Amino acid sequence: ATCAMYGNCGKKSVFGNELPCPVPRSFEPPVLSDETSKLLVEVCGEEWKEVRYACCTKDQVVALRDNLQKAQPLISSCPACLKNFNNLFCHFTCAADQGRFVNITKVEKSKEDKDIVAELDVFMNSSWASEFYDSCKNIKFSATNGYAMDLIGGGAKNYSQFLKFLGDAKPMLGGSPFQINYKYDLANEEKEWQEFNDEVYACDDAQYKCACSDCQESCPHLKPLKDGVCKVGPLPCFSLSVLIFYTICALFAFMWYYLVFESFNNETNFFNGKLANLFTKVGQFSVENPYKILITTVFSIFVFSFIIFQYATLETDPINLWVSKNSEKFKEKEYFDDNFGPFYRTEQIFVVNETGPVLSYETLHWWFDVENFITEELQSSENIGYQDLCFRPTEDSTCVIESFTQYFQGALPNKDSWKRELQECGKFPVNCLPTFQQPLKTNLLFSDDDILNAHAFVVTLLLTNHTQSANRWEERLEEYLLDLKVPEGLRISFNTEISLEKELNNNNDISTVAISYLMMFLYATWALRRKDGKTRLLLGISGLLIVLASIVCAAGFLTLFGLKSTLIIAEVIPFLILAIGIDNIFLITHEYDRNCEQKPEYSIDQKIISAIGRMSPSILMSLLCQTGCFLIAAFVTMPAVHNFAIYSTVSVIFNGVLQLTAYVSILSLYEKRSNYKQITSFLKTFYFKMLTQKRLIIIIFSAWFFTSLVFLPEIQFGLDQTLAVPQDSYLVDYFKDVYSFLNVGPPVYMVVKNLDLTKRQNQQKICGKFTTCERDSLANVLEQERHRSTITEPLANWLDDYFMFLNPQNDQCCRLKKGTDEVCPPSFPSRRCETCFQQGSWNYNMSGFPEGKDFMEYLSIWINAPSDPCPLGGRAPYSTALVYNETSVSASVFRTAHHPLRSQKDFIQAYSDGVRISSSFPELDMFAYSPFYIFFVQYQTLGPLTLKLIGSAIILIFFISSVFLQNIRSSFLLALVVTMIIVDIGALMALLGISLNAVSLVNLIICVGLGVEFCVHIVRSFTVVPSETKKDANSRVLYSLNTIGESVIKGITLTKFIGVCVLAFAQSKIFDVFYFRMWFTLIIVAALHALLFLPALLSLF
Ligand SMILES: CCCCCCCCCCCCCCCCCCCC(=O)O[C@H](COC(=O)CCCCCCCCCCCCCC)COP(=O)(O)OCCN
Ligand SMILES: CC(C)[C@@H](C)/C=C\[C@@H](C)[C@H]1CC[C@H]2C3=CC=C4C[C@@H](O)CC[C@]4(C)[C@H]3CC[C@]12C
Ligand SMILES: CC(C)[C@@H](C)/C=C\[C@@H](C)[C@H]1CC[C@H]2C3=CC=C4C[C@@H](O)CC[C@]4(C)[C@H]3CC[C@]12C
Ligand SMILES: *[C@@H]1O[C@H](CO)[C@@H](O[C@@H]2O[C@H](CO)[C@@H](O)[C@H](O)[C@H]2NC(C)=O)[C@H](O)[C@H]1NC(C)=O
Ligand SMILES: *[C@@H]1O[C@H](CO)[C@@H](O[C@@H]2O[C@H](CO)[C@@H](O)[C@H](O)[C@H]2NC(C)=O)[C@H](O)[C@H]1NC(C)=O
Ligand SMILES: *[C@@H]1O[C@H](CO)[C@@H](O[C@@H]2O[C@H](CO)[C@@H](O)[C@H](O)[C@H]2NC(C)=O)[C@H](O)[C@H]1NC(C)=O
Ligand SMILES: *[C@@H]1O[C@H](CO)[C@@H](O[C@@H]2O[C@H](CO)[C@@H](O)[C@H](O)[C@H]2NC(C)=O)[C@H](O)[C@H]1NC(C)=O
């Protein structure tokens, strides 16, 4: 055939490889000999079997073979890439029709006085080259963790750049002895020179499959798109749905513009009758025996009061009061703790120079003198320094101190060039390895990657000691940083492990609790003052003592069962019971007071029973409504607020019993002792005149409800940390510092359980660096989630490292004494030990990889490798990432990490990313564990839950009210207004700035309970009226507001207003945001609906 190159004619110059000898195209080389053909087929491939007029010689082919092994090990990972290299070079020399696409631009005279090619030109197009570049575009150099394109192609980004390096003449570097140029353009209208072409193989090519890490095409691009989770259009989807609903409703209204209860009442009527008889029975006993009942109450308080002091008055800690012990995210933590040890105990310290760079020699000199002090010679009260508690990657290794000081091995740098040294270490961490041999990324050590201009740098200390000794040192560290003096202009914010626990139980704001009672006491006397003008001080005091006695009795009774109340939640209860407890006091006394001027025939004792009997149903409903709502709220599994419901349910039942059996007896004596003479409009006539505009009132409020109904989807989620801890604390500074001066997120450990990892089938679902690994393997899937999910850090796959550790290429990694299975000790420097796997036994397609028993035999060697000579030694990094018993690997951990997570919207989102991915592997028995997952487990289903609980409460009210009221058309109206209030509160919940948590969920669940109190009294009076009042609706509602309106304004509304008004002045910001705003807004809204909407609504019921 036409050969443009055949044979060699000596070296161009001294110490130079022999160059090819140019020959004319017409010249016909001799047919390939048997000896030559044998080498060509094996070196290049089977395609050269049939070639006859090959343009190569024995010395020419071997020369190419010698140089191929220079690069073959560097691209052997991708079989497709390897094939292309061989074909390009093999056809570049031995192609039969070489002259078709090969031209010799220039020639030179060799030392042997023989012409030798100096410049070579080859004709192709940008199709073979373009595909060839694509195949090796993404190949990764595992050893350096960088692209092999950097070395082989000089980091070429385009095919021209890559092939330019290949065609460059670098004989000294082993490159092409003579310059080679590529001619992509080839017109050849005369059909003289034909273009270069052959069979290309991409990474995805089935025959020559390639791993995902070496090419994206073979990687699981089949990612099911996830979307439609936020909204549609510029507004929430729900809002649009409701808005269109109104429009269609208006159209129906526009179209129309042109134009048994009594059967069951028999049992229900008798049901209330039996209720009155029983209640009247209690009244007579409690009034006729004001000593046997009063005395036992005092004694009962002592028994419960003593129990609190003696048996238990304890509290809890964050993990025991914000995460349920039955949730999956907690049962998974216990598994992780038992096997892979509890997570470390961080001590992050931030050094901040807001408004300027922080890194200066005086600052660096100052810090180095205190970082060493903390981690070397601090010592707790028991003399246990950091070195006795630090985290050591192995038996012997310097303590892990993730700080920028470790770049200099902990020694002060010289002032002459300290700036330059740090920049180089930060840019290339591997060079400046710390004392414990672990590179420190600049993101984990500075606020940004510029370092020099960084505003703050982080200093993380890790403790692997989980005994009480570690707690004492942390207390010493906290007391050492608070009293530490910093240079002018800086600022230190830190957080030990015990800081949060110590700071939640530190806002002893009990002072405000006393004031609220005292403020309520002042009002209580005024509210209960005799209509004549006399003030009954004893009744007001007796009312408060009953409330306090209920809490004391409730705590004692529940202390026996072992419940513990947190300090933060133990301060709300006094406010809550005061708000609701005193509410019944005014009614019972007010009804008796009304009976003072009427029915004068009855004596003091007789009148009392009448008041109790008359109000028996109204009060009882306020109890069943104030007890069912709390019990409903107990369905929240967070122990801090689950105990809040239970501690409040018993603090109202006991109060209810006390107010019916104890307080009445006090009234039996105080009134009897007084024996007052028989007791015989402004700002009121104006009322009931504004209510004449019934139709207008409904329109305004109905518009308010519908408007508030579209803003619900804007309610935020999450409980901010800075609220929980007291203000003016050292944790609020830290939390504001993590959200701004941190660049590394929490780690996530993708635990895997009950996997053989000794069978080729199972090993293929984890590996992600070998061609035959399953596409949907763990390493492969997580690789793609990096660009789509919150888990965006490289996976520390131990299995991949274990296999590569056996690579015969790395002779220093796996070594065995010849003829024996004993691992060759590192001391032996001679060639008395061979690699564990022979050259022909280790292939990238996992051909002869360890299997069955062999897998565990070599796992012991890898896990115990020194790691010093071979960087892939797994002892240091994966010492505690495996759980094995020399027969199988019980469990393993693949570490990853999220991105900084600069808010509570990221914390919730990050949690679902760890739960979604862990559910994408139906075969693997896997779960993802990050330290913060347990705390954010409620937000996964808080949306559906807050509708079931609040929705279930409203249905409950419609049922108990229906029985007690006996009038369905009235109970439904009551439920329609309570649900109206909640939706309005839900909208204002978003506007004000409150979030939806377990704390806010229970507050909103008990809002219906409070909301029913305002409205139930009006409905009850309206439903049942004296014969004198007209049976028409308009007069009946007017009558009710004139008989019970006064009590509602004073007893029901103003009482709660004073109870919660003082709660605004609270040291802890959690009380103000969640307990005050929610309850203060409820009173305003409920006081409007109950007193302006419910009257108007009932008029035209
Ligand atoms: C006669 C007695 C029996 C009557 C029948 C039962 C009545 C039950 C009424 C329940 C009222 C619930 C009020 C909840 C207020 C707080 C809501 C907080 C936010 C919330 O639930 O989630 C957002 C919106 O939810 C949503 O889906 C928003 C819609 C919530 C319901 C809207 C009001 C329902 C009707 C009220 C009147 C009933 C009259 C009864 C006479 C989520 O937002 P996202 O979708 O972006 O988040 C997707 C991720 N989770
Ligand atoms: C510096 C090296 C390590 C970089 C470039 C990577 C791979 C090297 C080994 C590759 C890249 C291009 C290759 C190359 C270019 C061209 C020729 C001319 C041909 O007639 C014989 C093979 C030969 C001589 C090979 C030898 C191996 C080379 C030089
Ligand atoms: C009912 C009260 C006692 C609750 C709301 C107050 C505080 C505790 C129980 C809870 C509420 C929110 C929790 C919380 C919020 C967010 C974070 C950030 C995360 O990276 C670590 C856990 C951490 C730091 C935890 C710690 C425990 C907290 C602060
Ligand atoms: C914090 O950063 C500033 C910014 O350079 C350091 O220097 C100050 O720079 C501002 C702005 O030029 C000047 O107004 C101050 O007078 C500088 N103060 C100095 C030089 O002490 C500052 O030193 C840094 N704080 C430290 C190192 O503690
Ligand atoms: C955590 O640190 C403590 C304190 O050093 C260790 O407790 C010591 O254990 C040794 C056992 O040889 C005793 O001799 C000491 O008296 C203990 N000291 C104290 C203060 O109790 C504990 O062993 C460490 N735990 C771990 C898991 O390393
Ligand atoms: C993985 O690749 C190796 C290497 O090719 C295969 O083992 C044999 O390799 C020799 C030399 O290349 C071939 O002549 C043999 O034909 C190969 N064996 C077979 C069965 O073809 C090994 O087979 C490959 N394994 C898989 C699963 O493809
Ligand atoms: C080593 O530990 C593993 C734990 O992963 C044991 O796993 C066995 O797994 C099989 C298959 O699921 C079960 O039928 C066995 O009951 C498991 N063993 C036990 C003890 O539960 C494995 O058996 C252990 N082997 C040795 C020699 O201890």
Side-chain angles (χ1 to χ4, degrees):
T2 47
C3 291
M5 191 36 88
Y6 189 67
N8 307 92
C9 279
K11 65 196 181 295
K12 174 144 80 191
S13 78
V14 299
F15 199 69
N17 182 233
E18 73 199 348
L19 273 88
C21 205
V23 298
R25 283 170 64 177
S26 64
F27 149 76
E28 308 296 82
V31 176
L32 278 168
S33 60
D34 56 356
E35 279 289 314
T36 59
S37 197
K38 274 192 311 283
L39 261 183
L40 272 87
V41 290
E42 75 91 357
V43 301
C44 291
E46 279 201 326
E47 86 88 14
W48 293 99
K49 194 137 62 162
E50 183 48 59
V51 59
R52 297 280 155 282
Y53 295 80
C55 324
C56 272
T57 55
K58 170 56 71 70
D59 284 324
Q60 220 175 339
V61 300
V62 296
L64 166 57
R65 185 192 60 72
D66 306 306
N67 319 127
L68 271 193
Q69 63 239 23
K70 292 280 151 286
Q72 173 265 17
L74 321 196
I75 68 170
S76 185
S77 183
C78 206
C81 187
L82 185 70
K83 185 81 165 58
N84 307 134
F85 254 58
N86 289 256
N87 291 129
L88 199 152
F89 293 10
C90 295
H91 302 317
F92 164 101
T93 61
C94 314
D97 292 332
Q98 191 191 1
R100 293 286 167 289
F101 54 93
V102 178
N103 184 4
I104 41 167
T105 297
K106 186 159 56 46
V107 296
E108 264 194 64
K109 190 58 49 161
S110 84
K111 271 175 77 71
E112 307 201 307
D113 296 332
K114 312 300 191 296
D115 187 76
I116 44 163
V117 65
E119 295 289 324
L120 189 134
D121 275 24
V122 190
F123 307 115
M124 62 305 297
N125 84 98
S126 183
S127 59
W128 207 101
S130 59
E131 215 66 9
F132 154 82
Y133 175 71
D134 197 358
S135 297
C136 323
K137 189 201 306 204
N138 263 315
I139 190 158
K140 173 68 105 176
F141 199 75
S142 76
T144 319
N145 292 336
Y147 269 43
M149 202 23 51
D150 287 334
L151 164 153
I152 195 149
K157 65 103 178 175
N158 155 15
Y159 62 90
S160 66
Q161 283 77 335
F162 182 31
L163 284 59
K164 186 249 181 185
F165 199 171
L166 307 174
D168 284 321
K170 311 288 161 271
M172 61 305 297
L173 316 178
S176 65
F178 47 86
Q179 180 55 54
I180 294 156
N181 305 115
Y182 294 77
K183 309 303 302 312
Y184 305 105
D185 59 293
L186 183 77
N188 66 276
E189 271 69 38
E190 287 76 1
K191 287 147 272 279
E192 307 306 316
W193 286 325
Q194 266 45 252
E195 216 150 48
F196 164 71
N197 184 359
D198 220 34
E199 287 63 63
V200 303
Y201 311 66
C203 45
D204 58 6
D205 209 314
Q207 296 70 359
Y208 295 6
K209 186 62 160 48
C210 200
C212 156
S213 69
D214 301 326
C215 199
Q216 296 280 115
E217 303 303 335
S218 88
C219 208
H221 70 87
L222 289 89
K223 302 310 304 181
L225 210 73
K226 60 104 183 174
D227 53 58
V229 294
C230 52
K231 57 178 189 284
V232 301
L235 70 168
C237 195
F238 182 87
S239 308
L240 187 76
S241 164
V242 163
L243 277 165
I244 62 176
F245 187 110
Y246 297 168
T247 312
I248 61 172
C249 192
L251 280 159
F252 274 65
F254 190 92
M255 155 272 262
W256 210 269
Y257 194 43
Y258 291 174
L259 186 65
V260 194
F261 309 150
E262 313 318 291
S263 77
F264 300 160
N265 268 34
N266 282 265
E267 189 148 46
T268 301
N269 268 271
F270 306 147
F271 161 81
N272 272 115
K274 301 139 189 158
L275 205 76
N277 281 118
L278 154 54
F279 252 58
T280 48
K281 204 181 82 72
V282 158
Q284 53 172 2
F285 184 13
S286 61
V287 73
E288 292 292 314
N289 296 258
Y291 295 118
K292 281 179 291 306
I293 275 289
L294 190 91
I295 288 283
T296 177
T297 286
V298 170
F299 151 78
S300 199
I301 289 159
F302 173 69
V303 158
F304 289 121
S305 188
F306 157 80
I307 280 158
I308 290 159
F309 166 96
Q310 194 267 333
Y311 255 93
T313 177
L314 256 283
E315 322 289 303
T316 36
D317 86 316
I319 295 142
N320 282 307
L321 60 99
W322 202 239
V323 54
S324 171
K325 324 302 284 293
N326 292 310
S327 60
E328 214 67 11
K329 290 290 127 189
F330 188 92
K331 292 182 179 296
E332 289 166 0
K333 174 170 164 289
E334 301 283 46
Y335 183 96
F336 177 84
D337 282 6
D338 286 12
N339 282 304
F340 314 111
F343 199 71
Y344 318 125
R345 312 167 64 83
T346 62
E347 270 86 354
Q348 270 192 3
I349 301 148
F350 287 96
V351 188
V352 186
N353 183 6
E354 266 177 349
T355 81
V358 56
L359 279 198
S360 191
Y361 192 67
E362 68 283 11
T363 298
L364 189 140
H365 163 78
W366 165 79
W367 179 250
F368 262 87
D369 299 332
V370 52
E371 169 164 348
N372 309 349
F373 185 91
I374 285 157
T375 72
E376 298 194 321
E377 60 193 11
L378 183 60
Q379 295 166 354
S380 91
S381 56
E382 317 186 295
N383 322 317
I384 36 168
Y386 182 64
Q387 298 266 309
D388 303 331
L389 308 159
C390 68
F391 159 58
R392 304 188 175 287
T394 61
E395 180 185 356
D396 62 272
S397 274
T398 300
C399 294
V400 173
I401 292 161
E402 315 202 292
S403 166
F404 89 99
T405 63
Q406 303 308 275
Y407 281 146
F408 314 90
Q409 270 77 355
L412 273 291
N414 300 274
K415 180 166 184 302
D416 84 78
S417 62
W418 83 264
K419 276 195 231 293
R420 184 179 46 71
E421 298 254 31
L422 189 58
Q423 291 211 104
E424 294 298 314
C425 299
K427 209 193 303 312
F428 288 100
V430 176
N431 305 3
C432 305
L433 269 165
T435 324
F436 40 92
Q437 305 285 282
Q438 287 202 344
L440 302 157
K441 312 298 294 307
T442 191
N443 61 32
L444 164 60
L445 267 48
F446 288 97
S447 70
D448 51 28
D449 294 277
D450 198 7
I451 283 172
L452 260 286
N453 289 276
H455 275 230
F457 63 87
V458 189
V459 165
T460 319
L461 311 171
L462 303 157
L463 298 176
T464 197
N465 186 302
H466 299 108
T467 61
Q468 273 289 294
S469 283
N471 283 54
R472 287 182 185 84
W473 184 77
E474 295 173 0
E475 284 190 276
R476 183 75 197 77
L477 179 61
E478 183 190 8
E479 294 159 47
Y480 173 64
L481 289 170
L482 279 161
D483 84 318
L484 177 60
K485 186 183 79 63
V486 312
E488 177 56 88
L490 301 208
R491 162 169 88 71
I492 282 173
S493 55
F494 58 95
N495 163 49
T496 60
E497 188 71 351
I498 51 146
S499 274
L500 184 80
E501 179 182 322
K502 193 190 299 311
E503 302 240 317
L504 287 173
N505 299 287
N506 217 70
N507 46 17
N508 294 290
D509 66 296
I510 305 106
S511 173
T512 175
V513 170
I515 300 300
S516 198
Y517 273 80
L518 178 133
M519 226 184 162
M520 173 53 73
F521 160 76
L522 269 75
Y523 175 87
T525 66
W526 187 71
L528 280 170
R529 79 194 295 92
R530 275 201 210 282
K531 172 55 147 54
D532 300 302
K534 188 182 165 197
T535 63
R536 300 171 275 180
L537 257 289
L538 187 66
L539 292 184
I541 291 159
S542 302
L544 287 161
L545 270 43
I546 294 280
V547 162
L548 290 171
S550 45
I551 290 154
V552 167
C553 287
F557 176 66
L558 282 154
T559 293
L560 268 68
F561 306 137
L563 274 79
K564 278 171 260 289
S565 198
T566 76
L567 174 50
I568 287 151
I569 297 295
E571 290 189 278
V572 173
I573 284 153
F575 294 127
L576 190 54
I577 310 314
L578 171 153
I580 326 170
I582 278 188
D583 266 43
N584 286 343
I585 293 301
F586 184 30
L587 303 173
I588 296 156
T589 299
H590 190 92
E591 293 303 316
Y592 160 80
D593 210 324
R594 190 199 321 290
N595 275 209
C596 195
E597 87 214 328
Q598 275 96 23
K599 330 176 174 63
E601 69 194 6
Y602 295 159
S603 75
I604 289 280
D605 281 26
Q606 277 187 330
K607 280 190 279 171
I608 288 296
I609 291 151
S610 160
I612 288 283
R614 278 181 56 266
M615 260 317 182
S616 164
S618 192
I619 192 167
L620 183 68
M621 186 167 5
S622 174
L623 218 77
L624 257 79
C625 162
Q626 283 303 142
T627 288
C629 289
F630 281 99
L631 278 171
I632 292 278
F635 281 124
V636 184
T637 47
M638 315 314 129
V641 295
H642 177 96
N643 284 1
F644 180 52
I646 306 310
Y647 262 70
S648 289
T649 291
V650 173
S651 303
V652 297
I653 285 160
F654 279 19
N655 184 266
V657 166
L658 259 48
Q659 293 211 324
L660 288 203
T661 200
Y663 171 74
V664 65
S665 286
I666 285 82
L667 191 58
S668 190
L669 309 181
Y670 176 75
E671 274 294 305
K672 190 182 298 316
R673 174 177 178 75
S674 45
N675 273 316
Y676 213 65
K677 63 100 179 172
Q678 198 76 273
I679 202 158
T680 55
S681 308
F682 177 47
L683 298 154
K684 181 58 57 162
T685 186
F686 201 84
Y687 218 161
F688 323 132
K689 171 63 202 86
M690 150 166 32
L691 272 47
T692 57
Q693 318 201 259
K694 297 178 274 157
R695 189 74 223 176
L696 172 57
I697 291 280
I698 304 185
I699 298 315
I700 303 310
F701 274 85
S702 210
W704 184 12
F705 162 70
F706 288 123
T707 306
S708 285
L709 178 55
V710 287
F711 291 2
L712 295 188
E714 307 200 356
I715 294 160
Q716 299 296 288
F717 275 53
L719 206 156
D720 207 74
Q721 296 89 246
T722 58
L723 306 175
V725 305
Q727 63 195 256
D728 282 298
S729 185
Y730 74 88
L731 281 174
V732 308
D733 289 355
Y734 164 74
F735 288 130
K736 159 165 142 53
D737 271 355
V738 161
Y739 285 2
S740 51
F741 299 144
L742 200 74
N743 272 271
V744 84
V748 60
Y749 294 107
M750 311 275 318
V751 174
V752 164
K753 310 174 280 192
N754 287 54
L755 199 69
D756 281 328
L757 280 162
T758 51
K759 288 153 193 69
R760 190 46 46 65
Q761 317 101 57
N762 294 122
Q763 292 174 130
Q764 276 163 352
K765 304 184 267 177
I766 297 285
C767 62
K769 277 199 187 85
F770 310 102
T771 55
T772 172
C773 298
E774 263 180 52
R775 190 165 280 176
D776 58 282
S777 52
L778 167 49
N780 264 335
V781 168
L782 278 175
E783 178 56 27
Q784 292 302 337
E785 301 280 19
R786 282 183 52 207
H787 317 118
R788 183 181 70 168
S789 190
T790 293
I791 302 183
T792 69
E793 300 262 336
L795 189 72
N797 208 351
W798 67 275
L799 194 67
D800 295 320
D801 291 351
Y802 164 53
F803 283 130
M804 303 294 292
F805 174 86
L806 308 171
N807 194 356
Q809 302 290 100
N810 316 317
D811 81 320
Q812 285 111 26
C813 296
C814 214
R815 301 183 59 74
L816 285 170
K817 262 176 284 196
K818 272 178 267 188
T820 46
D821 303 336
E822 167 55 83
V823 52
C824 194
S827 71
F828 301 170
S830 188
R831 309 177 296 166
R832 61 188 304 154
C833 306
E834 76 291 2
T835 47
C836 301
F837 273 41
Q838 307 299 345
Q839 189 60 251
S841 325
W842 201 81
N843 324 135
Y844 264 78
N845 64 7
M846 304 186 3
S847 56
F849 276 27
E851 193 175 10
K853 305 149 196 274
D854 292 330
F855 179 87
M856 291 295 328
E857 310 315 303
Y858 293 92
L859 188 76
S860 184
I861 301 160
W862 161 74
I863 196 81
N864 296 304
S867 187
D868 185 6
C870 167
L872 306 184
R875 177 177 176 178
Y878 311 112
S879 203
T880 62
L882 271 53
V883 181
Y884 56 106
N885 47 4
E886 69 165 30
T887 295
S888 301
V889 183
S890 182
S892 41
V893 166
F894 311 86
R895 187 172 90 268
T896 336
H898 304 243
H899 61 56
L901 300 199
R902 314 200 171 290
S903 178
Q904 281 232 344
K905 206 205 299 204
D906 295 325
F907 274 122
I908 299 154
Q909 190 201 326
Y911 169 89
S912 42
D913 285 4
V915 176
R916 166 174 64 71
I917 290 162
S918 67
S919 78
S920 301
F921 304 88
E923 299 299 88
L924 282 65
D925 198 343
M926 142 197 292
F927 66 75
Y929 168 76
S930 184
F932 78 95
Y933 277 6
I934 59 176
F935 298 108
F936 291 78
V937 68
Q938 76 206 252
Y939 310 113
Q940 187 82 318
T941 63
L942 175 57
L945 183 66
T946 185
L947 303 180
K948 292 161 66 174
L949 301 186
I950 281 154
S952 297
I954 280 147
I955 290 152
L956 190 74
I957 299 306
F958 178 65
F959 276 36
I960 65 190
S961 290
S962 165
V963 171
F964 281 51
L965 293 185
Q966 312 170 347
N967 199 5
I968 305 305
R969 199 169 288 98
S970 297
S971 279
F972 179 84
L973 281 185
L974 170 55
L976 179 55
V977 169
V978 164
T979 187
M980 196 158 287
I981 289 160
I982 293 285
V983 166
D984 279 281
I985 293 282
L988 266 76
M989 181 145 81
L991 165 59
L992 283 161
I994 300 101
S995 313
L996 190 74
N997 306 319
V999 162
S1000 192
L1001 170 52
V1002 298
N1003 299 14
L1004 197 58
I1005 286 160
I1006 67 177
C1007 267
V1008 309
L1010 300 196
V1012 159
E1013 260 176 341
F1014 299 86
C1015 301
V1016 71
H1017 287 314
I1018 288 159
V1019 166
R1020 178 74 193 188
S1021 305
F1022 171 90
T1023 306
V1024 306
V1025 311
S1027 155
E1028 305 98 293
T1029 55
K1030 290 170 287 306
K1031 265 269 165 185
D1032 53 348
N1034 194 357
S1035 203
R1036 273 202 296 183
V1037 63
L1038 276 161
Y1039 156 75
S1040 280
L1041 284 171
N1042 270 294
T1043 288
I1044 216 154
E1046 184 64 26
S1047 94
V1048 164
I1049 286 157
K1050 283 170 169 59
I1052 289 298
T1053 294
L1054 258 291
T1055 279
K1056 304 179 162 66
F1057 184 111
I1058 298 283
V1060 310
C1061 168
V1062 172
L1063 190 61
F1065 314 138
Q1067 283 190 98
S1068 205
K1069 279 207 78 57
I1070 190 166
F1071 286 69
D1072 167 74
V1073 178
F1074 289 100
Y1075 289 104
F1076 163 74
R1077 281 192 215 161
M1078 291 215 58
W1079 286 342
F1080 191 74
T1081 309
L1082 164 61
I1083 289 148
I1084 292 281
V1085 169
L1088 290 167
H1089 283 82
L1091 271 83
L1092 284 174
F1093 186 64
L1094 189 47
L1097 187 62
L1098 292 156
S1099 286
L1100 47 87
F1101 76 104

